[model samples]
Target chain A: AVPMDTISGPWGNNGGNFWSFRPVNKINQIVISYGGGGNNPIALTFSSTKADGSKDTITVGGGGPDSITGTEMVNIGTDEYLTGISGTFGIYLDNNVLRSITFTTNLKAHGPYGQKVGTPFSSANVVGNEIVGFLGRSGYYVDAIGTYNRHK
Target chain B: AVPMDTISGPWGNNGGNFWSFRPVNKINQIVISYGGGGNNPIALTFSSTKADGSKDTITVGGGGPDSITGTEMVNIGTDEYLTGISGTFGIYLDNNVLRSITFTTNLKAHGPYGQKVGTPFSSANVVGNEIVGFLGRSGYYVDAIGTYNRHK
Candidate 1:
């Protein structure tokens, strides 16, 4: 198993939710970015494998544009956006994807952190109170789950 | 001092926020209906008074149509609409000009309740999530108080 070098989730501002994994020989980057450059931060974590049962995993957190740091992931994904849920009315991540840590939270949605992805949340549709949210990759988000609520 | 037979402030749909008070022996029956109808309710409390300042008290909760009831009051009040900020718009208890008990609460802005006049809140400058409100006698509306914000 091979590990990547960065980890970035919807870690700041309003776009903070997550989920995913990848194969070693996939690509260079796979992150989400909802627009705006204020208080938003990032965090990502992924590993890699060769075949049905052969691979390695790496971890790091240092990259382009903003001195971001995360493990380099393979076959990972993205939901990079240039803005929020208004005007554009479209979901944007704009957050970064880099190597960070092990998905050791109580959320078991990312599944073994590999090829196929699983979700921790019980549902797919995400709602909010009026602040921010995240762009999904394959029908999911990465998050710690806090201070969130449905609104009127 | 004379205990009025009815009282009113701002009443109607979408007209919430304020407090008001008035004298008795004032009108015959005048009102104009707006467009549609939705869920709008009211609550008002008052007291009575005789010569030397002695008085009685009453609470009524029915007016307009729909048979909404309260403590059997005299010719009453309204905001008869959908919503408001919650405060004193004005007071018009039975239109009585006598000394009454005590109609008190935190909010004293509207003076008791507005244009349509059916309100319970005791102050002015209103605030809330999404709920009921006040009204006026003529083409007046208590308020939505569009000027809202989180203080510092």
Candidate 2:
């Protein structure tokens, strides 16, 4: 007879595999546009990879004809993101022409070179322009965690 | 011998009576609608009075033939206000609407009730439908010293 093992009399088995568990690869570069031009306004886009390496992209447009003004606070990965535009013309996010793009988010936009005050607008239009005045001068700082939760 | 005389300082001078400083003699009334039936819908009206003895009337229609619902909220006086809805409708305070109303002083409607959540709509529409699920049910409360703010 085989040697009796002194193991427990009753052995319960719980078997399952964590199919959701997987390694995350590096994040992909994201690009956003502010539709700019004579008729076309500035647009925005974002590209990145999820934990499972799935590609994710977000593009927002449909702003009337007007240069996109104001600063932007975006969230990329677990880090905060911020961008500002000043002067007559300049392109930072992609080769999209600047002007048609505007800041619509409630976040305020400061002037270039850390100027605390500046004129701000969101989604330009030919009609009466939307002015940010003194309130828009204090640009916004992105909070990645907070933004993630808000969007979710 | 000198005769006794009454001497008065500049205390007797009174500035023009300010409407805010004097007690109101009359009152104004405001009315609003919230729930209603199909086609005809339900109807409701309430009366309120202002301090200056001005009266306002509120009338609510049952709704349209296509189950269109509606609601309204109006401030009766400097200290009294009311808000509610009639049917399945949304309330929208566009620039046009805001520009139409005239007030003795600068006035602003403050509340998150009319804010559209996941969908693009007004808080008035949510209140008209009587369905608070899709909308944020924050309830009605006063914010400043004498203001009525409501949430769907």
Candidate 3:
């Protein structure tokens, strides 16, 4: 098995249930649903491909009182892969939680979705590898977030 | 064994032999020696205790003609624990290497020794766990550095 690289974080506070999605292969897409007031992701969805070419997906957070403002999706290209991640986390709605998130790929960067208020984090750019999985704490809203990285 | 927390990094460009020191128990001390002009660390040393009560020490890098100006050591108290790490890494003397490093614990922080130029990295302050080990690439000078964290 390929060794895991440095985990970016489980950035944010401890206020929700734990959740994670670790796939054995490449991630293909990501969907993030934001909440009102442009703060914190209400839900996050990840899609990946298995060794046998089957599809795998996991969704964490959402389904509470927060209204969904809009949704953003990233479609990974055939030759592209995730490279880095950065964002902020802090007090929101009286609870310390993930306030914003941004994803980086070999080709470009995705949303800095949510309000960029709070402590910041970044995986930075490391060569020869890519982000493979994710873990976080969430309940109705994402309380925290982190990325798992490994070799290509 | 308690689960590992997020790894800060193996920051800096890969350019040396790989080395790591992972102690099963608490780390007691860390000694870092800097090179001339305060550019990068010439060496790094770690001390820990084994389950059998034996001392475990590992030193990586140094011993070349880089000329060690001085050494700084952090003595961890019985009630204290390591919490975070941050530093900078970039091109130096014709090769990319670790330019600086810092360690943080429950009570305080230690040495951001060396130049703080280049890409930055941090483990952040995650509660409940401490930095227990280190991994990196090094030769005459530390080419890179990263921290391993685990629960107390």
Among all windows of 10 consecutive residues in model 3 chain A, the one with the lowest summed lDDT is: A49-58
- Which parts of model 2 are misplaced by more than 4 Å? A1-28, A34-41, A63-152, B1-152
- DockQ of every predicted complex: 0.00, 0.01, 0.02
Pick the TM-score winner. 3
What tens digits encode model 1's per-residue C-alpha lDDT throughout A6-73? Answer: 22232322222121121212222323321124212232322322233322221111112343322223
TM-score, prediction 1 = 0.17
Looking at model 3, residue B32 earns an lDDT score of 85
Candidate 2: deviation at residue B29, Å? 47
How would you class the docking of model 3? incorrect
Error of 3 at A133 (Å): 0.4
TM-score, prediction 3: 0.47
Estimate, for each residue in B1-152, the C-alpha lDDT of model 1 and write its tens digit: 11111212222222321222111111111122121132222333333232223222212222223332222222222322111233333333322111111121222212111223333332232343211111122112212111111111
lDDT (10s digit) by residue, model 3, range A12-119: 666665554544346788888877756457777777653434454556666367777788888888888888888887776776766778888898888787788888
* Better candidate by TM-score, 1 or 2: 2
Q: What are the clashing pairs of model 3?
A: none
